[PDB]
Amino acid sequence: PQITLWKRPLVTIRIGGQLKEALLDTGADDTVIEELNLPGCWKPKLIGGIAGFIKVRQYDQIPVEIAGHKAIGTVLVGPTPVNIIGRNLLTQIGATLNFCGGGGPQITLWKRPLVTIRIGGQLKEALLDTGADDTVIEELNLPGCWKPKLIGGIXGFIKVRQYDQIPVEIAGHKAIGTVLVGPTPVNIIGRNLLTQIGATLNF
């Protein structure tokens, strides 16, 4: 399938014999599913997100079918706000990010998909993140008015400054839209801008 990013990339998965809905998430190292019974043995782990750390149950070598594509790998079970398929399984199903329908660069998911952006006349490194609704950039003194906002993910919520109509060049591709500024651990390019550069998930 080729999946565009105007809506959250939610797909049905099969796991432990049950169906679940989950987000294909290039900005996640790992796969995190809401509390559930998983046949398997587990061990405690902590993982981090936009707003801090949570405790999860780590299950290894779990079969998961993602839109009909098979994977067998680590699945973390815990208090995530949305079920997420991260790179550990996206790589197993041969998922890549592609610009402009595949006419542009292809980015594999073996490592975090970090690319150079230009914003406010400044160059920064940011993660191309299909699991982000918004674009979140580390503290940077952007000019212009703004409005306070809170955005969530693993760990809860952080406060950010919302700036609209900010030009952002991504790997040489021009975009313009809302940028949220605040204490994110990693700079994130989310769907609001990935759609403007024609980025798709492909597998």
Partner: peptide, 6 residues
């Protein structure tokens, strides 16, 4: 493990 915004 770092894992991404809603």
């Amino acid at each position: 493990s770092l894992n991404x915004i809603x």
